[PDB]
C-alpha cells in the first residue's frame with residue numbers, strides 16, 4: 001500500500017530537528033515512525049535536512065549501491081544524520097536503540113518519475 005518513495009520519507013526524514021540531542025532520540029523516533037510495530041527494525045538512519053536537499057542527491061554523484069545496482073547517488077556535501085541501532089539488550093517488543101549523531105555524505109538509491117530516493121544505502 002505505501003509507495004516506495006513515501007516509505008523512504010517515513011523511515012528516514014526528520015527535518016524537524018537539526019540533530020539528535022538526547023540518547024533517547026532513537027527510541028522515540030523508531031516508535032513514532034512505526035518502525036517497532038511488528039518487530040524491532042535493527043538499523044535505521046534519520047536525515048536532518050530538508051526533503052528538497054535529500055531529493056536533490058538523485059542528481060549528484062552516481063555511484064554503485066552495495067548490492068551492485070548502479071542507481072545510487074552520493075551527496076556532494078555532508079548532511080546531519082542520526083544512526084539508530086538496536087543494542088545487545090533489545091528484545092521485541094521492548095526495543096532499545098543506541099543513538100549516534102554524525103555529519104556525513106549519504107548514499108541513496110533513486111527511482112521513478114519523479115526520480116526520488118527510495119532506499120537508504122549508506123553514509124560515508
Ligand SMILES: [Cl-]
Nearest residue numbers: 003004005006
Ligand atoms: Cl509517493
Ligand SMILES: [Cl-]
Nearest residue numbers: 010033034035
Ligand atoms: Cl505508519
Ligand SMILES: [Cl-]
Nearest residue numbers: 043044045120
Ligand atoms: Cl538505514
